[PDB]
């Protein structure tokens, strides 16, 4: 199960049943969970945690140090991740804790880059050439299309979506669609939220869409839709708004 | 001629003066055709057949699984192939019949994305990161910059120019140039016609590229150019409208 | 400090304190300075030349031939350079003189891609993906951004900056900042010209912008400007203008 070609470190943890391939490297202190597949080529380096049943692609490289010229250090993804040929996920620094985390579920397409001290949640798709710069975080579900970079310190929330071939600069409200070049919600992520919820909390969000960004201040709109609120997805959208440091980009 | 180093599964087939390079990796099913060059690190996987004379370039990877969340099998390309540098051409699955397909001559840069059940002709070129999504068909002498996804299912005729930093989501007539985001046509590749035909054929290519764009229903328009038509080049632009299933994109 | 996996072909020239580690590759002609490192998988092709104190990461390729149908040769980097990982920077032919080269300082990100016959000054800066076709010139201190393709032949001044998700098809006057796509001259790069030069030069920069980019033409306005001239900074914008071979991109 593990290619004697494979160069793993004294000190490397590997659970049970685990797939080293040819010429894939783990470092000293590695920790590879339970049936993991390292394909060939690929670096498993720093400090970084692979959670189990996770499959590791031919050469991606997972705990490379930050792309910076000003330079205990790792990334963290949690079960069930796919990473596809040739991804940069790199390491955290100490302007966060040394950590890039990843959360379970993730599936993380070709030339992918996740640049230092990141924090992705559970579900989250990049599809090819998505790049994430410097202390992005993506809410739980969200999808970045292809060839889409994300500039650093950008939140984006749980359920959007961030559409290929755009670029992004400000914080995406949770369960919208953003697009453009810089990048702007145009809508809600219908896709997303109708694959999770029924029509009744999508008829919500709609409303809530519409209540948020159609005119207004959006701060005074997310404080009008708090009260008395039943959902607890348009309470993350308002708190979201309400919390924001980069602002919202909205379309017109 | 063939690294110690290079991992060849027993079963699979090599043909006559073959280089495989260090490190790079054959499967049990892949079928190595004549004079084919195998660089450092590349992975000829699955049920994947590499025609003579073609030369796979560090580490580019022909065969790997297709990029799905729900998921016999492979790759087959043609003659004379070049494949650079970290290319990723994935197989196809049971929507198609398994097989990802490329004809001769293709010009295949690096980091570019083949996604599973494309179809594309001969004499194709992609420049650097350009990407194909699933079930993508390219006619020959087709070009698609660098930096240009195109979306699934998107059929491109022959002798198509699909500009760089464009973005594509409908079919392209062929012999037309396609740019921008969402890319559409602006005019013949009128650089690709006048390598291959006379100034007669471009001029009849010009003719019929203003008779069926310039104004008016492009069904009713091609079917009027069909009429008595010498051209085969005008009847391929025609019957492509006439079979089209994702409508033509076109500028104003 | 050199693995076994390593592949160093007979007439490699290494340095002192050299580490290379496994599965890298050098070339028979390659040169490789005092104090480098060669990360796994890494290739050193060709008549390349490889500076002090630089590090190229895992799976970067400098000195493979160029992207080219129609084809002594190689790739001269200075030093303390960095090579992120799967960069491809690929040799010169005989429409230079056989030769890429890079300065010393470079700093060059994850799937970069650097054509044949570059010419690129000290202290460069290419972020994810940034692309240099064919005998693109980049002077000391040009910053690209991500995801941004450059045209064949284009020159970029001293101290610009290309910004990322855009397309460079003109020639760019030094110290400017350039976008869009067609990619054209929007300001100064304020940000790079503030980090080396102290309020008095940025000032002359700024009245110098103003004065060849408000109104008129670009030449007669940069003669003008060359009258009695205190500023070598100012002077090099002007001499670039006149000396331009591509014409020069301004935004309206
Ligand atoms: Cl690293
Ligand atoms: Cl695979
Ligand atoms: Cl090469």
Do not use: W
């Amino acid at each position: 199960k593990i290619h004697p070609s494979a160069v793993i470190e004294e000190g490397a943890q590997l659970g049970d049943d685990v797939v080293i391939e040819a010429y894939a490297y783990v470092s000293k202190d590695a920790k590879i969970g339970n049936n993991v597949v390292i394909k060939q080529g690929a670096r498993i380096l720093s400090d970084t945690t692979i959670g189990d049943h996770s499959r590791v692609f031919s050469y991606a490289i997972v705990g490379d140090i930050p792309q910076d010229i000003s330079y205990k250090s790792g990334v963290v993804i949690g079960k069930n991740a796919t990473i596809r040929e040739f991804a940069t996920i790199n390491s955290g620094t100490a302007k966060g804790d040394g950590f890039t985390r990843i959360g379970d579920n993730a599936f993380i397409m070709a030339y992918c880059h996740i640049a230092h001290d990141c924090l992705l949640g559970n579900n989250i798709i990049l599809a090819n050439n998505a790049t994430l710069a410097g202390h992005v975080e993506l809410g739980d579900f969200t999808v970045v299309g292809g060839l889409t970079p994300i500039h650093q310190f950008v939140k984006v929330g749980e359920g959007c979506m961030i559409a290929g071939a755009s670029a992004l600069s400000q914080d995406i409200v949770p369960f919208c669609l953003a697009e453009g070049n810089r990048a702007s919600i145009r809508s809600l992520n219908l896709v997303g939220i109708r694959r999770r919820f029924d029509k009744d909390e999508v008829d919500r969000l709609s409303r809530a869409f519409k209540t948020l960004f159609r005119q207004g201040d959006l701060k005074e709109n997310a404080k009008n839709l708090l009260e008395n609120q039943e959902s607890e997805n348009v309470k993350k959208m308002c708190h979201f708004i309400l919390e924001t440091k980069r602002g919202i980009p909205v379309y017109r």
